[PDB]
Design a protein around this ligand. Structure first.
Ligand SMILES: *[C@@H]1O[C@H](CO)[C@@H](O)[C@H](O)[C@H]1NC(C)=O
Lengths: 318, 219
């Protein structure tokens, strides 16, 4: 009459309680599980005839989620409880309705309330390099102080990346361009990125680690909040225009212009039907651009660039 | 000596077929590969996790073996597949493979494979590059050159590009991917100083049609 199991788990997860017996004909006697909520209410909850499960009457209050099985090879009698609930807390004993009064030393099953993980990030937008970015994450539905919370960066075409996180006995407060803090009273966590770089753009994601506590665990992510970085606002610079033709395909290379509200167009006075502009900032703090189209190896072309204040053309002949 | 995850740049399949999203692991000991999905608008969730040793799968809330299956490719070794069966358009999105690293305190994700579900059959056309070298006028005027690459006429609208002379890729500017229907394109330019102009640099690019290994262009 020695049972095992009775761990601590939450009200969604299953459990398997086992019970081992020695010293008598285990194969020949019937076996039952009983239950006392915290004690003093020992009620027959499961009955099986170890001969085999010919008579198995486990349906007082746990019907549908109780499965008692007897092996007898390891002398095991299990009661698997598949969908536990708040009131399943109690002492589970091992022992038309056959009389059972030789009870054993019941194990205790403690079941905890449900945890929903609500992570709400906020504080994104568009920012200028060098400026200091502070991001908030509201965390509701779980015990905060003993959670494990981490920030992740999701950049399109880039692998998601871990930024900074914290444990229960964290006491760390990492310094650097990546800063994480937590307010225990408001149940909030915070990210801080000073001197925002360009590769620092993307969607920032609060994340909670959940699971058994091992490599099986997973990351619950919030909706995230998006962050764009745009060049440090510099004095106006006017673009340097060049034309590069190659076998019926011309490109107009424009560079070093802030702001980038220019209207670049490839045209001898004839507007090209195939032409597209691609604007991208460089590592200097100003935008460059390329407006690309097609014009044959014989034909001659022109490019016009109306960056505010000036207007630069470059033409190439036949 | 950190753990890396190589994934194909994308996977497109006709609706109703299967989808093998591959993931090659490098320097991992964690015995557990996870699969995460990011669907535009929804928070990213884990679909499931597979054991490198036993093969057992653990699905997450509302996911199951009817739509997802994770295994380890017997071919090439240490390759792992997430097989999405009976594709729909809600199945579209980003599929990452992930692991725990650095004593289990950080999670490492792959670059991501974008699953795109076409409503009918599709032409899987590959990209065609054209290269413009820096001109004598641009080296005279700006004491630097600009290598302009236009990748044109590829499907699907997904491609990765970079430049490497050095092992770390060189910092370029990348244009918005522009196009529609069954033709998309992207331009990428690399402004290199007048000193490194003589160095033989190499331009690398990856697209679904060229498999997993990249394509290279010298000079
Ligand atoms: C926080 O991280 C350390 C890393 O060594 C780990 O040992 C510790 O257990 C973690 N905190 C908790 C409460 O587990």
């Amino acid at each position: 009459l020695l049972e095992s199991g009775g761990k601590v788990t939450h009200e969604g997860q299953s459990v398997t309680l086992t019970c081992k017996a020695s010293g008598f004909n285990f194969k020949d006697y019937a076996m039952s599980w009983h239950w006392n909520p915290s004690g003093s209410n020992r009620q027959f909850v499961a009955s099986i005839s170890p001969k085999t499960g010919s008579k198995r009457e486990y349906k007082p209050s746990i019907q549908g989620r109780a499965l008692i099985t007897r092996n007898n090879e390891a002398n095991t009698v299990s009661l698997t409880l598949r969908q536990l609930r708040k009131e399943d807390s109690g002492i589970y004993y091992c022992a038309l309705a056959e009389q059972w009064e030789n009870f054993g030393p019941g194990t205790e099953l403690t079941v905890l309330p449900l945890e929903k993980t609500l992570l709400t990030e906020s504080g994104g937008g568009t920012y200028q390099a060098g400026k200091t970015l502070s991001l908030k994450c509201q965390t509701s539905g779980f015990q905060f102080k003993t959670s494990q919370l981490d920030w992740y960066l999701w950049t399109p075409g880039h692998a998601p990346l871990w930024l900074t996180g914290l444990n229960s006995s964290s006491t760390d407060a990492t310094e650097g361009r990546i800063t994480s803090s937590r307010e225990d009273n408001k149940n909030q966590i915070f990210l801080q990125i000073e001197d925002l770089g360009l590769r620092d753009s993307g969607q920032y994601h609060c994340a909670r680690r959940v699971g058994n506590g091992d490599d099986t665990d997973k990351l619950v992510f919030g909706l995230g909040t998006r962050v764009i970085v745009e060049p440090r606002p510099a004095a106006p610079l006017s673009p340097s225009v060049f034309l590069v033709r190659d076998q019926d395909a011309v490109a107009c290379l424009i560079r070093n212009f802030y702001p980038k509200e220019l209207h670049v167009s490839l045209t001898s006075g004839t507007l090209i039907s195939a032409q597209s502009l691609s604007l991208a900032p460089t590592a200097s703090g100003t935008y460059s651009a390329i407006h690309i189209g097609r014009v044959g190896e014989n034909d001659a072309i022109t490019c016009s660039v109306k960056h505010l204040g000036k207007e630069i053309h470059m033409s190439h002949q036949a | 000596s950190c753990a890396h995850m190589k994934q194909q740049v994308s996977f497109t399949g006709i609706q109703g077929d299967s989808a093998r999203i591959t993931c090659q692991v490098s320097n991992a000991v964690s015995y557990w590969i996870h699969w995460y999905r990011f669907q535009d608008g929804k928070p990213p969730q884990r679909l499931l996790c597979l054991s490198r040793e036993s093969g057992e799968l653990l699905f997450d809330e509302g996911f199951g073996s009817n739509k997802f299956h994770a295994f380890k490719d017997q071919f090439n070794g240490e390759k792992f597949i997430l097989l999405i069966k009976k594709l729909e358009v809600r199945d579209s999105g980003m599929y990452y493979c992930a692991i725990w690293d650095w004593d289990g305190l950080v999670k490492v994700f792959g670059e991501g494979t974008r699953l795109i579900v076409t409503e009918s059959a599709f032409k899987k056309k590959p990209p065609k590059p054209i290269f413009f070298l820096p001109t004598s006028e641009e080296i005279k005027q700006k004491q630097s050159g600009t290598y302009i690459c236009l990748l044109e006429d590829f499907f699907p609208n997904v491609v990765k590009t970079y430049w490497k002379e050095n092992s770390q890729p060189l910092d370029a500017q990348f244009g918005p991917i522009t196009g529609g229907g069954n033709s998309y394109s992207q331009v990428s330019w690399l402004t290199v100083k007048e000193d490194v102009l003589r160095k033989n640099l190499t331009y690398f690019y990856q697209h679904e049609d060229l498999g997993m290994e990249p394509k290279a262009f010298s000079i």
